[model samples]
Target: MSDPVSYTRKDSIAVISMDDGKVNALGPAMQQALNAAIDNADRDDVGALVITGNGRVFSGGFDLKILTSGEVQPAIDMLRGGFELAYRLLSYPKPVVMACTGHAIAMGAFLLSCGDHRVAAHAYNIQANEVAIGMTIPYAALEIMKLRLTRSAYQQATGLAKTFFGETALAAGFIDEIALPEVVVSRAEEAAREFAGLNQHAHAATKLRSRADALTAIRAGIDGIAAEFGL
Candidate 1:
């Protein structure tokens, strides 16, 4: 079977791509593979990291099969794993860039917020559909959103479950730039390479300083949030 997540080194950058047939879902296996890829990137001492998904959809969110399976512990474990992955990306030592190929929904949208820089296809959709789908937003997810989005955008996203597209996503802070679908990956690579030139230690330190409060809040409230989600 093909790997759900694949990692390759591109010059000084590590590129991780997710491919799970279609509508890449953040299932437990995929999450584990992604985490492993990130670990490999760190071990190789990559200057920067770029994460993207194959084809159109970046990810549709958590695996519905597991989420609705009525298995309490498994569902909780999946939710915790997703949040942990997001946190790890947010606090990653190297600059992290996301090449949002297409639609990014729910956890997928949250993952976008974890990127230091994000580039999306001009026609793609980015949505936080948790409320719309009847799930309360998780605390860790909220903290990450607060740190990355504007007050108005955060409210719209969490309260209204608004879906932002292309330029609007950029304006709402869901993505930093927009590019043609054909060039999204290249654009993200360009940004990652630029970031790769920065002093690594300084970059890491500054990122931690900039997001310290949010990280702390996420750590402190994640357990409670997980419980609230009935995960």
Candidate 2:
């Protein structure tokens, strides 16, 4: 519908679906599309939000070209392009649920940390590969990782770039639950519906209250990236 990102709703939950049809690469375009979708979802009288990917993969990563452009600004832009959306999802007022289709890696795996509730298919790799590939984890992305992943998993994910799949993801804290692929999206919607029953006003208040530190730290991390690298 809208190229890589599409906005739609199921029942009372707003759904943002990403499918770049290739690697589902994230960049300024996908970021704008995702932000717009989130804006629309917020404008509507929706209960909760569900984000999912297309086919067998969720996202490939940030725009690989930008990351490999060998240019500082481009790399920082690429970093913001994806992490901004991650922070957005992390700080979204209403509940945010992820229906991970499959093969969530790198930025995709980081997104697994952003959701309030995550439901994934029974199999496929969810991972962070920065260290394995000669890059340290982005500080902002690292904050996202720490928010959802266990401490041991945090070390492995941020340092070792371990691959998490199935119950391993659950054990590592990448996903809260697993389900059949055919019903993964529905499972997320079900979780959203459940979340919707609560008073959204209170939900918003509590969500921000609970994550106050991470919210501030994540934003600070973004600024840290820009300040240290933008020069």
lDDT of 1 by residue, 1-231 (tens): 268999999889999999988778898899999999999998899999999987978889889788767677777788788888988988899999999988999889888889999999878999989888777888888898899788899999899999999778888899899889999999999999999999999999999999999988878655765577554
- Each candidate's clash count: 1, 0
| Model 2 C-alpha lDDT per residue in residues 115-142, reported as the tens digit of each score | 8899988786888988887777778888
Backbone clashes in model 2, listed as residue pairs: none
Candidate 2 off by > 4 Å:
228-230
Model 1 Cα displacement at 56 (Å)? 1.8
